């Protein structure tokens, strides 16, 4: 009945940002020392409450969102950010109460022929609302000329591949990001510390 963080952090394969994975965690005891007393992580910035004190707090649900981005774009995973990833793929709200954990995964997610299994959205008619997921592949209309499902000039496929290669610079290398969201809503606390 311990909370299955291993399934999220230790997954063989991660989601793409535009189709970011969300794991609901409920009805269990969460040992937060496993994640936070670790030397793995390259980025560990909480915004709501401090991770040390995590064990003394208690929540309705916790949401573990997971995805892969470039190192350069880990900065965009934070409240009030803007950019391709924050606006079109994964947006956190300004009242975010959680933790952003990121780590370098060049050894896992880069291949010499290019790793095209991780995509992102580069075009969208409006900015995402916080925690919106857009999985549409509708051709993006970039001009006044309409796209009736056909790609051409000013009509672009909305998704792009990272093509992660091992030779890339650290800023261009893949990073696995898990974002922990602690909501304490109108319902009882169903996840808590030891």
């Amino acid at each position: 009945n311990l909370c299955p963080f291993g399934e999220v952090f230790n997954a063989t394969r991660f989601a793409s940002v535009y189709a970011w994975n969300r794991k609901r965690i409920s009805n269990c005891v969460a040992d937060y020392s496993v994640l936070y007393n670790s030397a793995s992580f390259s980025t560990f910035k909480c915004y709501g409450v401090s991770p040390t004190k995590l064990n003394d707090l208690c929540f309705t649900n916790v949401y573990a969102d997971s995805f892969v981005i470039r190192g350069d774009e880990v900065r965009q995973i934070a409240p009030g950010q803007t950019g391709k990833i924050a606006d079109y793929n994964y947006k956190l709200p300004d009242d975010f109460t959680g933790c952003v954990i990121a780590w370098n995964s060049n050894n896992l997610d880069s291949k010499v022929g290019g790793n095209y299994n991780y995509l992102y959205r580069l075009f969208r008619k409006s900015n995402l609302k916080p925690f919106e997921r857009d999985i549409s592949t509708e051709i993006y209309q970039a001009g006044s000329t309409p796209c009736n499902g056909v790609e051409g000039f000013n009509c672009y496929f909305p998704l792009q591949s990272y093509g992660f290669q091992p030779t890339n610079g650290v800023g261009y290398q893949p990073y696995r990001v898990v974002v922990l969201s602690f909501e304490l809503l109108h319902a009882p606390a169903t996840v808590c510390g030891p």
């Epitope: 291949k111 290019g114 095209y116 299994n117 995509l119 790609e151 051409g152 998704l159 591949s161």
Partner: antibody
Framework: QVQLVESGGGLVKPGGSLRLSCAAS????????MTWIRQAPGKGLEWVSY????????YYADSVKGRFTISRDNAKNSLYLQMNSLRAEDTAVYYC??????????????????????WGQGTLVTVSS | ALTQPASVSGSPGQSITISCTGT?????????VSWYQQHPGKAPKLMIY???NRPSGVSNRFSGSKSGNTASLTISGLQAEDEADYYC??????????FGGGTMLTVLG
């Protein structure tokens, strides 16, 4: 180190069935789209079919549709082509090839899985009475 | 299904181009045109992908271009070892790949 070896070719009579296999080494088989491409003696390349990582995204050429079944075993690192109702026009070298880029986890990955490297040596299939 | 010239020939050292014509639904619709060279008794070798990308190791004499519904493979400074069959392929609107009929390139002299 990366290696693609296909077997199971030979003689088959018109209307018979034959099963080709391709064994892979040196890369994580589970991550890529896999193809069969064929070439008749003295003739050009003809793309046959390709399969995604799970096996749930499959595309066939019109010449081959309704007769061939592509399939994959990730635990055994093997690709298979089941050919049925063979005719003489199916006589060809059947090459097994891997998409140079890994894009197998998505149905959308056909976009980034359409240029092929490495290839195997090929297997000769003769449809004759 | 993609249209290639059956054969072309150039003199050594010259520049030579091989055209591959498709339709709106393939070469004209996407930037996923690949080129392969094939020598006698060998498997095809990828020279160009995504219209113009060259894999690492392929000679810089090979380059790829696209315009309209016609892709082109161009070889600068022909050499006798470039004499082979050349095939273009592209991704289709039905998520297939189709190849052209192939082109036997002859080096004169």
């Amino acid at each position: 180190q990366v290696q693609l070896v296909e077997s199971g070719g030979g003689l088959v009579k018109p209307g018979g069935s034959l099963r080709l296999s391709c064994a892979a080494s040196g890369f994580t088989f589970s991550d890529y789209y896999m193809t069969w491409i064929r070439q008749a003696p003295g003739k050009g390349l003809e793309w046959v079919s390709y399969i995604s990582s799970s096996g749930s995204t499959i595309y066939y050429a019109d010449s081959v549709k309704g007769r061939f079944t592509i399939s994959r075993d990730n635990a055994k690192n093997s690709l298979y082509l089941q050919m049925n109702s063979l005719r003489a026009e199916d006589t060809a070298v059947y090459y097994c090839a891997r998409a140079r880029g890994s894009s197998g986890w998505y149905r959308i990955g056909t976009r980034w899985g359409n240029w092929f490297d490495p290839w195997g040596q090929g297997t000769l299939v003769t449809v004759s009475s | 299904a993609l249209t290639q010239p059956a054969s072309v020939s150039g003199s050594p050292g010259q520049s030579i181009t091989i055209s591959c014509t498709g339709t709106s639904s393939d070469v004209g619709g996407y930037n996923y045109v690949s080129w392969y060279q094939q020598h006698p008794g060998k498997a095809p070798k990828l020279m160009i992908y995504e219209v113009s990308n060259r894999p690492s190791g392929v000679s810089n004499r090979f380059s790829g271009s696209k315009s309209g519904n016609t892709a082109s493979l161009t070889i600068s400074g022909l050499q006798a070892e470039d004499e082979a069959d050349y095939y273009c392929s592209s991704y289709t609107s039905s998520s297939n790949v189709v190849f052209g009929g192939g082109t036997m390139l002859t080096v004169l002299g």
